[PDB]
Design a protein around this ligand. Structure first.
Ligand code: HEM
Ligand code: HEM
Ligand code: HEM
Ligand code: HEM
Ligand code: TRP
Ligand code: TRP
Ligand code: TRP
Ligand code: TRP
Ligand code: KYN
Ligand code: KYN
Ligand code: KYN
Ligand code: KYN
Ligand code: CYN
Ligand code: CYN
Ligand code: CYN
Lengths: 281, 281, 280, 279
């Protein structure tokens, strides 16, 4: 009922790279600082739930920036591999709601007051990803005005073409009928749905043998949006079961404010084309 | 607009108050990723994040299992089962996240595996703590932590205490089951040996579920925990097979074969063994 | 790279009960009849996606009926074990959307034509489940006029207390302040949120040590509702990526009509009590 | 707390194609015929668990046959799209074990005896998939003697090149150093690992810019094999918690005989090349 230690296994790493040194585990595993007094059992779940999410969001931003570089270089297969990993990261972010759903309102009311006004609405990394996918709201910079350095990193992504705008620029380089404004415009203004892209996407979806690279990237972007909307929905269903329709710590109306983001679309013309697409030829 | 306006009442004057980033210590958490490849390797951020998210979930899993043991010691069955239900979800997220790392190819990994030196998850103190708590106590593993005295002392404290499984047997003894007296006090550093005298104890529980509903539900909770842990081991081992094949491990082991030896172990043997003789309820 | 057969393995199955015989697989695996001419590759996925869902809905109704019978008999642990299986069945119904999301609009437009007016709106088993959980709608009976035996089955569940009403009757039996109307009423009417139940759920969630059975079942129902809403949401997102805002085959506006079901609640007082619960 | 019907909704479906009609739900939903007397609550789960699996295996066979046709035609992107769906189908087959794990041994012992010798060892569609992916075993044909039509469909896939063999023939068409034997061989023989393929896969994995199609397909097949092994493992863990180390209804030793299949490989040279690939 025991596995013997194999010969050859290293035990003295004191002058070599260590597992705890590589992964900076003393730093990482001292970052959990529950505030309840006396200690509340459920506050450790609460901290770890958001911290695991912030680590996945860090990786998601790293991958999405690389997907943008690939698109800029017309490196389609490399972009698609990076988007495949991005999808898996968003899947873990969505799946993990099942842990926090074991937190009841009885448990949460034991420590919610220690949070003060702290909220996920104040997540810089979340807002960075929202902006990079295209949901640019300059009103969010004033939310971070109390933190100038974070505000600057959000302004940077605000001023750059989104992942979706980089996709349109890739379609323009391959002779699609992309309007000239996608070559240069005020990137800080959120993309507005453009009916002139309808015939561009109809031609891709209806001639998939010719436009297989474009078609596969369209579907990768619908997959990314769909998974992000599921993250939003599972978060909002968690809020409903934990605080119901109470106002949020961050000062919003709570569920209704979250429902307003579920009504937004990152890649509107990819959804809109469904109403007019015919059979593949 | 397909922009969400900021609601009135949202907190933005946050320079002197607790914020999300403050509460969750995100300056500390998100400075803990220190890739070593020169020049930078794209895939090293995934590699670090994959292990760090796992270590955060293992930290929560130890926190929950300690509480499940306290509840069992106090005969608090419904509370114990609620903590076990969360423990299962945590083990499920640890298992599901293998899907992210399976996007790492051997081509990618060979660009930075040499930076890791002898570092390995085999050297994870929190993983070893969980293995010991569930009852896979191998005193040979203390020498892996010989150069971390505080860590070694933490692993000795869980070595010297009854496992979660031994606490379940002690709970069964308090409710009049035919538990041998050795489970009241024995050398707990010695890993549990499968005990044929427990066979009739488990047969009686599984065949009289209306009388022994509390016991039956806890048996099934433990079988769930074991099965999810074995799934974690299997998915890790399948990931090792697709990334390094049958290469020896950084930690100095044979790799896949050494991992297969742990898959062969059972935490709760009498609960599996009873299946060969149980009849109808 | 070959596993040898062990000697004791039964290889002469002529006249014996076989896997295929027990599971009626001749019957099951002859029930897929694509109508596209010539055959469209993607139509097999389409049929299999809904048929697997309907087998899961068949099991979900079987379990939820058993959960009601346990509640009626105050058999709480049995009820919880049946609700645990029910949650896992709803999890499979929700997860499997990932398969259908590999169907693109230009694939579907190859065969949508063959479906005529056919729609999951006309799923008797889905509606049966919706009714049993408590979203009763007598307007649906007319949809099943074409199938009088099916229609009667839907009317039977319409006329019996829901899962939620059987929960309230269970609370009444253990001295909770459940209004007398839950003892007997016209069950064909969809439950409407009842403010007078707030103090009942406040007491349960604020004294979990005393009311652990009630607390556990409350959380089980919130879990069932949450997973049911995630099914609706994943179905709706699949509709958006396959037909967008096109009208549905069944004659509805499509996404907007589906979004109206997302605003329905099975267990309204369990969600409402979150605004007033105040430390246990 | 009620949604009104919109006026455009079709409510008069007498004589029209309905959901139930299109999906043959009369035929599908009469296919559950439990044998316990009196009826055992858990037998419905038992039948539905295998019947949902058999519907997914029917789609999986349908998709993989299409993946082979695309490979035969050098249609790499279409192949990859069908393998992506195949992966999702294998994920549902693996995830659904979580339902059957709510079956305890004292429930199953209430009706196991009604099954007689019936076993998933006798799943034609499972064996068809196993053979198509490359784990050929002529000893299985005798199991299906009772079903002459089924046996012949299983002998056909036995005698056809595997998905893996079709991949190697694809690599041979694009100038990779694939031995001549993969042009015509006795296909009823299971593929043994071939050390002459190591340099072929080293070149693909070490030059991914040049061999991006091949590399992408290599990873698709490693994905399919990994997900298939996870189905085997989850089934084997379910057997352990339901019957433990009892002999199987099908007459095998049970868990140990299942564990032997976990050591089988569909695409051995794809795993073997991990020990020699460089940066
Ligand atoms: C008990 C669990 C939770 C509750 C009750 C909750 C509640 C809320 C509420 C009420 C809001 C709106 C802003 C406000 O007024 O505070 C919000 C926003 C948000 N929450 Fe949570 N949340 C929960 C868990 C989480 C977790 C675990 C994360 C993980 C990072 C998260 C991330 C966010 C994000 C990013 C936003 C901004 C969404 C947007 O602007 O559209 N929340 N949450
Ligand atoms: C590229 C991915 C991975 C490879 C190739 C790999 C390889 C290995 C190898 C070869 C071993 C045996 C010890 C050794 O010789 O080093 C091992 C053990 C281990 N690995 Fe990993 N691993 C991977 C990812 C992970 C991740 C992400 C974690 C998460 C913390 C992890 C946790 C562990 C643990 C806890 C053990 C000890 C298992 C036991 O003692 O039974 N590994 N791994
Ligand atoms: C290509 C995939 C699908 C599309 C485009 C689609 C579209 C729709 C639409 C438009 C409706 C509204 C009724 C109507 O006008 O027809 C609907 C309702 C429904 N669909 Fe689907 N559907 C899809 C797949 C599925 C699948 C696989 C199921 C599996 C059972 C399903 C089950 C239902 C159910 C139960 C309803 C009624 C929901 C309610 O009344 O609130 N659908 N679907
Ligand atoms: C209560 C649950 C289950 C038990 C106890 C069980 C047990 C067994 C056993 C003992 C065998 C070995 C052959 C024999 O001696 O009968 C086997 C093989 C098999 N079972 Fe199951 N099984 C279960 C559920 C399932 C389900 C739900 C499926 C769904 C398709 C399935 C598919 C198979 C297949 C395909 C094999 C052949 C595997 C191979 O040849 O390597 N089983 N099962
Ligand atoms: N988007 C799905 C299906 C898919 C795979 N390859 C594609 C190529 C084109 C269109 C869709 C796809 C996926 O990535 O799994
Ligand atoms: N073990 C499964 C099924 C289950 C639920 N309640 C139970 C009570 C007794 C035995 C098994 C169970 C679970 O925890 O979901
Ligand atoms: N509802 C969750 C958490 C839970 C488990 N047991 C409980 C008892 C009481 C309240 C909640 C729970 C579940 O079923 O896993
Ligand atoms: N095999 C993984 C990762 C992947 C995506 N695209 C690739 C291209 C080449 C190599 C691997 C990949 C997948 O299909 O998601
Ligand atoms: N997930 C968090 C992480 C850190 C700090 C707070 C939260 C919250 O969930 C608070 C939530 N906005 C609330 O209204 O209760
Ligand atoms: N997950 C890790 C985290 C930290 C340091 C190393 C690893 C490894 O996976 C190394 C592995 N044992 C190897 O043999 O390649
Ligand atoms: N899932 C089905 C099963 C059977 C028959 C139709 C469907 C549909 O999805 C049709 C859909 N209502 C449509 O608007 O295209
Ligand atoms: N899943 C099945 C479907 C149909 C008929 C039998 C089974 C079994 O699981 C029997 C199993 N081989 C046993 O040993 O109990
Ligand atoms: C969310 N806070
Ligand atoms: C849905 N039809
Ligand atoms: C397998 N029966």
């Amino acid at each position: 009922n025991l596995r013997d230690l194999e010969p050859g296994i290293h035990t003295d790493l004191e002058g070599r790279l260590t597992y705890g040194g590589y992964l900076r585990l003393d730093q990482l595993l001292s970052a959990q600082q529950p505030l309840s007094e006396p200690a509340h059992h459920d506050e450790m779940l609460f901290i770890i739930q958001s911290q695991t999410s912030e680590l996945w969001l860090k990786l998601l931003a790293h991958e999405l920036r690389a997907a943008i570089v690939h698109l800029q270089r017309d490196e389609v297969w490399q972009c698609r591999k990076v988007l495949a990993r991005s999808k898996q990261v968003l899947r873990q972010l969505t799946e993990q709601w099942s842990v926090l759903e074991t937190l009841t309102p009885s448990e949460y009311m034991g420590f919610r007051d220690v949070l003060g006004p702290s909220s996920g609405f104040q997540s810089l990394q979340y807002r960075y990803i929202e902006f990079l996918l295209g949901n640019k709201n300059p009103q969010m910079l004033q939310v971070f005005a109390y933190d100038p350095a974070g505000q600057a990193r959000l302004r940077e992504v605000l001023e750059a073409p989104s992942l979706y705008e980089e996709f349109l620029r890739y379609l323009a380089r391959f002779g699609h009928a992309i309007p000239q404004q996608y070559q240069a415009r005020d990137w800080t203004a959120a993309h507005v749905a453009d009916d002139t892209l309808r015939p561009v996407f109809e031609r891709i979806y209806e001639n998939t043998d010719r436009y297989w690279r474009e078609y596969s990237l369209c579907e990768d972007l619908v997959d990314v949006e769909t998974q992000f909307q599921l993250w939003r929905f599972r978060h909002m269903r968690t809020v409903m079961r934990v605080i119901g329709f109470k106002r949020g710590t961050g000062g919003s109306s709570g569920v209704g404010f979250l429902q307003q983001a579920l009504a937004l679309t990152f890649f509107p013309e990819l959804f809109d084309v469904r109403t007019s697409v015919g059979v593949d030829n």
